[PDB]
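Crash report, auto-generated. Payload:
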Amino acid sequence: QVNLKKKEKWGVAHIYSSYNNTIIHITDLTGAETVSRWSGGMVVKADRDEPSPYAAMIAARRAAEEAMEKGFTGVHIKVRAPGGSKSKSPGPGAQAAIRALARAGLRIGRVEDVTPIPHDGTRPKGGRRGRRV
RNA sequence: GGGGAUACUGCGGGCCUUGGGACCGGGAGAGGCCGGGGGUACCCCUGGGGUAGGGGUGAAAUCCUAUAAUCCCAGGGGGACC
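Recovered output after restart:
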């Protein structure tokens, strides 16, 4: 119980956003201790509705209120679209979730598109012609 | 079968330098080969965290996951690719 004068506790919200779901995941400043992890698939029951900025805001609110219960007055943001051979655009859930966090009242610090981009590229799926849908 | 002409072609000889070849100089270039050193990304293993879903679709399911998954963190390894 260190004598905390500031009560400016800062954590990190890692936001995995894709075209199929979104995961809010709040940790300490390191990232090695988790404090809240909420998903579209927790907050709803329709798979097609998992990605939505609706239910993204809800997952964000639940994770936020849990974290600001536990302390953590502010959060840095690390939004992450899927990997290198997959898509490199996050989705709507990202901006929706950061807006939801600000609404919840956590001081949003610095934001970063921490998306793993390859300097080479493994082969992506779909084959030579892609998805012929 | 003879005789004649000699521009062109051929044959022989000689000269030339414009075509081409050689050389020299400073540059250019993802030309090639061989060696070394790296870059993310991805996958697996280990350890820590943290629990109930993840994934995928037009919508779903197969599949993965409560032996602890997805997510996050620290290490190790791997093969491709720049």
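Post-recovery validation: Residues 80 and 114 of chain A are 5 Å apart (CA to CA).
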